[model samples]
Target: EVDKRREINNEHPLLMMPLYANGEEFNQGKYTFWGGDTLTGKWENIPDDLKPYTVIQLHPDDLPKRDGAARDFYEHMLEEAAKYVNPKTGKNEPIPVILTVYTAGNMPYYTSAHWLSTSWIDKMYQKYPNLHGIFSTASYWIWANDIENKAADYLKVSAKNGGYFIWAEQNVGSAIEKAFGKNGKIAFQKSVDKYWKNLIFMFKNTPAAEGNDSTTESYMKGLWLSNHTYQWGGLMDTWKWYETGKWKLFASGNIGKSQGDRQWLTEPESMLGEEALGVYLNGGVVYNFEHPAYTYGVNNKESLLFSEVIKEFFRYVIAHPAPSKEKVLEDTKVFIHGDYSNKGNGKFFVNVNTDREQTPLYMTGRYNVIPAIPGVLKTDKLKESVSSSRIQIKEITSPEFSSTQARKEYLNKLYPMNYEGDIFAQKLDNRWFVYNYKVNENVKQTGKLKFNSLEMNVEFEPHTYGIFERISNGLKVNLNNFRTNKDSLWSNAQDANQAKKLPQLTKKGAIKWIEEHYIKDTQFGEKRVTKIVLRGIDKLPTIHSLSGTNNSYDQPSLNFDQKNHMVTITINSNGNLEFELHFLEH
Candidate 1:
């Protein structure tokens, strides 16, 4: 009954979708949790709370021709995924099972990875060890040729069988490269040939490739290797595999506009700070996005309107994180057509101004401070894991050097302004996240601004992302505009390619950036103070959780200074917020 009232509303859903039946992948979906990923059997009546979040997608249409009914369709889809029962680890596991190949599996499609056979993928993972791995679609078919020991035996049999391998983009969808041509992996899949071959077969065969894999027990066996396709997935092509923490990346744009040029109501903090660098740089298992009418549904915009404040900013940077290093920080630079995501390993930072990105402005700290697209840069989302770079970015004004001739002079000086004042003090770790991104809206082009030389007196505007708060009686402007609701609805992307318009969202200044983005909410979008200072408290009964807002339009009025354990989050109301605080020193 709709998965038993979505398990009485706790909801688990990943059911996937596939109801072909008569249209064929061989007449699929009669029920078996539908979602045809080439199919096999038994998903029938799967409601033991949705069978512990089912995986079961399959492929390999016919290993070189029926190879024993393709190993009895992967041993009866692992005998109907070991007939369920996994209330999160009460055993009887093995439902997980993905396999939809390409990126150098010699093409030709019987679900090609050149038709499986490392003794039948090692007797189907020594007899169905949840064969979980392979979703390698169209990766511009890993540059037609040189199969590299069958893509290194499909990343050492999915890291000796724990699993992880996905490649969402590298073209090949021009109507499936105009219906399968195989060298013919479509002509424009050049995302630098799939992250230089998914980070050179992910630092030579995964287990998240550490110590350059000479088989440190398959580096304690593998996982994470998804390159969820471009937006700027090319930022300095993994600068020599940036200490290969086994790759993961993605993106999803914002307000490229429509819903009558957002005349529906509104949703634009520059498309919610460039999808807040797609939830702090999206990772494996798809995080593309969409929310509000759909999230703020004017034109579906990626998941832009604060849904439980970006689900706790994807619960602390993509499902419980902190073990990231974004390519060993090689002189972080942003002379405009920008980029960033220096996670907890560099303390934290998330900048990303636009370019081929059609439009982007996701900012953080250092003045481009549009604090609240799930941005509270450094009040402390860290405590004990320290590393050596506390934001020492050095872009002394863009000279560029990650080299291949600066990624081909930044892949052609990343269009949309050859005039963007730049700065960087990037060392970013040991807890000091200061991010900065900007495009248009007030472009005076930053100059003579010091980063590591460390100059910060003030007065640096243009989308005031450096969210200033000085007022003996002067600038209190936080300039944020999310749901403006005033659809005089006009401009049809007149866009002279303002290319990354900042000033808190633009387009001939969307109503003069709504007469400059407001935040004294409603007299009602309500945004006033910014004091979430909870830096390392030594023990004050911590734990203050928040959501997108409730209890009668009451967003942000959370207080808890408690002798400077500090937590005065008072914003009156613009909407959608999510927070999680833990304070202690023992």
Candidate 2:
């Protein structure tokens, strides 16, 4: 009944659960939908509607275990996936669940790339427009040795209209557990801190054009928490397996907190914000004329309070989207989070804005039903007394950057007292450290990481008015301008360390740097990227539509429009700079 209703509602709920039952592997090392990847026969007994909800997989050995196999498997799957049908949409089409490939079991091959050829895959893309690329696969256990090649392959296929995905595995909880172990929170928090710093810098780095500053901030701007994880079975599970009590769901990091910290009230419902009042005892209303009382009653009351608060909050969200989104973007950065999906419904960006320390916010929209423990209704109906404690807004400011004129004036006057008037007065390595700032409520506070100096050199540039806009607004910078394959600036660029350390250059910032300056012989263009290699847009779009592919909220997108047609730069015989825009629309 649930599946039937979901389909009737025109919903395609994207799930990020762990890989469940594996599909059967083919002799060619390919996973087929009809023959090899058929759902467990028992699933048929469950009913047609339940099919989409199952989080099964085609065999674990589906990864490229050998060289040519990766390419071959990728091609084979594409050929097979050319046929699929959505009963609800009444549209016969390719698969919506992106077909994935990864490395495994000491296998020398990442089956998709080892067996699939790029040319063949490209041909497959030309054959199908709905297909996304194979760029977003998690670092397959096999590519631990040469992740760069894999990342590059993902970018190549995806950079066109169909890009790859990042870290193909959606079982983020397991990935986190595998990577960080039991103390994952400590490591997770640390990783988040570092990631937050880089993300802020990247957001700030996106160039802003005149009059386009706000748009650039919104465009180059991004949601802080990229995405979140789900239970092994497509459900979001709080990690506390031992504790059993009424609890608050925190939006950010989870540190065990009792239900009292999350206060709740019970009263008559009205059009106003949370202001309900009442008490309950033994499944019956405890109309205490004085003080409400009960051991486990608070949690029960708070749950209903949270319900009222969220409803009112979203009611306001409907009235004002910008401020709400802006607040959310800055507040929720520490939690392993994602935009909350309202079942087969729209996403709720609300969870992302919640702080890690607060109660974990669950999806309360129509798609979610209140969890009801039969015969044990532990205070499930209540509301928060807005009169007691209200969520307050903090004044936003930046120590490194701020564009508020009033703030600028205050800083200008206070600089002498604070830094002894050392602002831009000294030069480092004969290079002036130019200071610039942008102030916005959503601009997140990041780690104290700072680049010593700005650097730029012209790359291939058929400079469009848009390109200059990117530069003037600080969205982009010319890093180096040597015609030779090797440029010192490329080596000296700010991202050099990231490359040396992570070896994964699938990020947009990393790609921008590499694309503008990689030596032709050493680096392949973005067109050759594929899945089974790395994360980006081109992971497995060939099998899934771009909009349908599962990815973190902030992964780099591979889209180039006529507005931003990239160009290559050259010099005239007279040694003067020349520019040329290079592209051809199919």
Q: Taking the candidates one at a time, how many backbone clashes does each contain?
A: 33, 99
Model 1, range 1-586, lDDT digits (tens) per residue?
Answer: 0111011001221221111111223224222211222232323333354334444445443243423433444455567665555555766655666555443334554333454565566566556656544544333334444443344455445445545443332221121122112233322223223321222111111111112111111111111211211111110011111122111111123333222212222333323333332223322112222111222112112223333333333333322232232321122222111111111111111223222121223332222211110011111221111431343222212455233245334423432222113621111232222223333333322322222222222222222222222222211222222332332332333332331232232223332332233221221233423233333334442333444434313444545545655344444433444344444431
Candidate maximizing lDDT: 1
Which stretches in model 2 have alpha-carbon errors above 4 Å? Answer: 1-13, 16-25, 28-64, 67-77, 85-91, 101-113, 117-120, 135-145, 168-325, 330-586
- Model 2: how far is 154 from its true place, Å? 1.2
Instruction: Estimate every model's Cα lDDT from 0 to 1.
Output: 0.30, 0.23
Query: lDDT tens string, model 2, 1-586?
Result: 0111111001222221122121244454434332111322222222244335322222233443556544454444445445545555866645422334333312354334344445655566577553443323333233243333343343344434333222332212222222222222233233322222111101111011111111111111122112111100111111111012222211122222222112111111110111000000000100001011111012112122122221222222222222222233233221111111111111111221111211122111111111111111111111122221222211222231133344334333422321111111111122211111111111211111112222212212110000111122122211111111122322323442321332323323322332343311222111111111111111222111112111201222333333333222222110011121222222
For candidate 1, the lDDT comes to 0.30
